[PDB]
Design a protein around this ligand. Structure first.
Ligand SMILES: CC(=O)N[C@@H]1[C@@H](O)[C@H](O)[C@@H](CO)O[C@H]1O
Ligand SMILES: *[C@@H]1O[C@H](CO)[C@@H](O)[C@H](O)[C@H]1NC(C)=O
Lengths: 42, 213, 51, 233, 51
């Protein structure tokens, strides 16, 4: 019998910045800089 | 995997004026960015590397700047020999990419010296006679060339051949080759090249009768 | 007998990491032109103490 | 002197293999990186691959990720590039380019510094991937009317139907250079290129000088030296 | 035959760590109201350079 261990993977992943790599593919990421605006003051 | 877009595709700048180029790049890039001057019929030559640091023994009129996304290249004092195409590369994605390319023009509006050439006897015997019209020395590159055979316009049988801008007189040259069959050539009498240029007061047309020099 | 040989891939993997952060530390230095005065000639008080 | 010379290339059928050499001569001690960059006439530059030290690259573009493989022979100081499973769009002028990095990077002298800019470019080798090697048929172009313009006359040579590029053309074995205009090749409806070379000389030399063309097409080894005489009236 | 099954405990521990720093990153953290002026209409001299 064989028992393989592995992690999950997505077909399309976001690129993030790290200490060593500038463009490294990860399964999921979120944006921390708010760049869009509604244009109207609530 | 990191596209480079230069703007515009081609620019016209008078000799002496400063020509600013653009190298917009998706995703951040700052450490490595190299500009090149590929003259027609020659290999590219390094101008600037990094962003602003110019290559060894290159003129000081080539200036470089930019950060992260937007990059510019300005040629201070322009010379007639700068009619080359310019490119920009990037780091890194372990995969360097080049730019699309920016064609640089120089500049007086020159008049096209139209010349017509009947098909030679050796080409008439082959079975396909192609008439050639020459537009030697003219500026700018824009030239509307039309083939009129027996007072009738012929389209789909002509191919426009344009040379690069000259390194000295800075004038282009255009050639159109109207390909037709052996019987299709003898079918008509007069062959005229309706040439209209930007700096042309009246449409200059050079023609010749079939069977007469 | 006895021999010695280095592994290129493991050494390259370490160099690729360090060169990546070496780029991260010297990248895009700030460009400042007309700023404030930082060395002063005589006493000015409120504005000078804040500068 | 840091020039390198690219040898090889030529015409190949799609699906075949071909390796291009790059004799790295001069200042390059060949502990520095090297790269290949291809460009098709009518298109811009495109980085292909890179090599470093020994087997540190392993750096190929996504277009050739599974086709091209880069070799390095430091003993004979030559860089290679085995281009397998060639497709139609692989037709380009493959340039072998030096690679330089900022001195802060490249810790160990041999290994790869992941930030390179190419400084010294090579002469380049043209590789054409298509299907036919036709010899060009040279037809002269004679002046008509009366001295073409009246003061200065014009004449031309035609290089119709040939494959592939390029074709070398000169006038009077290279003695005539002033006023010569060699036009670029234009692929016709049949798929064969067509070239024309014209020269404008004063009408005072219409009869006293015999003008000859020097059409040379090494791919098919067809070299015609056609005589250009006025359309005798 | 051949099958596949995930481990809930091993993934939950990784999910807890990421959400732990996810919460560490975003927060109300600061609430600012009346501050200084950053965009100016005309030149003011020294104080404009400091602001
Ligand atoms: C899911 C798919 O087939 N293709 C996706 C596309 O929908 C998406 O827009 C893109 C992100 O830019 O990533 C890829
Ligand atoms: C140290 O690293 C620098 C690059 O930052 C390199 O130029 C130098 O040769 C290295 N020296 C030693 C002794 O490793």
């Amino acid at each position: 019998a064989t028992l393989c261990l592995g992690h999950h993977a997505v077909p399309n992943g976001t690129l993030v910045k790290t200490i060593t790599d500038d463009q490294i593919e990860v399964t999921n990421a979120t944006e921390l800089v708010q760049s869009s605006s509604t244009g109207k003051i609530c | 995997e990191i596209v480079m877009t230069q703007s515009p595709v081609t620019l016209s700048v008078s000799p002496g004026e400063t020509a600013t180029l653009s190298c917009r790049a998706s995703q951040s890039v700052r450490s490595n960015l190299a500009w090149y001057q590929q003259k027609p019929g020659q290999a590219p030559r390094l101008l600037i590397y990094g962003a602003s640091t110019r290559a060894t023994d290159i003129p000081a009129r080539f200036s470089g700047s930019g950060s992260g996304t937007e990059f510019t290249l300005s040629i201070s004092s322009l010379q007639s020999d700068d009619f080359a195409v310019y490119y920009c590369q990037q780091y890194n994605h372990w995969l360097r990419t080049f730019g699309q390319g920016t064609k640089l023009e120089i500049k007086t509006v020159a008049a096209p010296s139209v010349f017509i050439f009947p098909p030679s006897d050796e080409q008439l015997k082959s079975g396909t006679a192609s008439v050639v019209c020459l537009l030697n020395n003219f500026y700018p590159r824009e030239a509307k060339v039309q083939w009129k055979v027996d007072n009738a316009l012929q389209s789909g049988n002509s191919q426009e051949s344009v040379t690069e801008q000259d390194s000295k007189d800075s004038t282009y040259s255009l050639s159109s080759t109207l390909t037709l069959s052996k019987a299709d050539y003898e079918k008509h009498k007069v062959y005229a090249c309706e040439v209209t240029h930007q700096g042309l007061s009246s449409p200059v047309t050079k023609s010749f009768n079939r069977g007469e020099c | 007998g006895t021999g010695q040989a280095a592994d290129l891939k493991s050494t390259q993997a370490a160099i690729d990491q360090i060169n990546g952060k070496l780029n991260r530390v010297i990248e895009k230095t700030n460009e400042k032109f007309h700023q404030i005065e930082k060395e002063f000639s005589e006493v000015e008080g409120r504005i000078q103490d804040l500068e | 002197e840091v020039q390198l010379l690219e040898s090889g290339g030529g015409l190949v059928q799609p699906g075949e293999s071909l390796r291009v050499s790059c004799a790295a001569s001069g200042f390059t001690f060949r502990d520095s990186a090297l790269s290949w960059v291809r460009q098709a006439p009518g298109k811009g530059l495109e980085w292909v691959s890179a090599i470093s030290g020994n087997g540190g690259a392993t750096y190929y573009a996504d277009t050739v990720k599974g086709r091209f493989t880069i070799s390095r022979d430091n003993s004979q100081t030559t860089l290679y590039l085995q281009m397998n499973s060639l497709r139609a769009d692989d037709t380009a002028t493959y340039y072998c380019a030096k690679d330089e990095s900022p001195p802060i990077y490249n810790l160990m002298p041999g290994y790869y510094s992941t930030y390179y800019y190419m400084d010294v470019w090579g002469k380049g080798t043209t590789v054409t991937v298509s299907s036919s090697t036709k010899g060009p048929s040279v037809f002269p172009l004679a002046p008509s009317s009366k001295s073409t313009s009246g003061g200065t006359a014009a004449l031309g040579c035609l290089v119709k139907d040939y494959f592939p590029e390029p074709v070398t053309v000169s006038w009077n074995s290279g003695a005539l250079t002033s006023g010569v205009h060699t036009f670029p090749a234009v692929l016709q409806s049949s798929g064969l290129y067509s070239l024309s070379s014209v020269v404008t000389v004063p009408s005072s030399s219409l009869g006293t000088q015999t003008y000859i063309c020097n059409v040379n097409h090494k791919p098919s080894n067809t070299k015609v030296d056609k005589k250009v005489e006025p359309k005798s009236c």
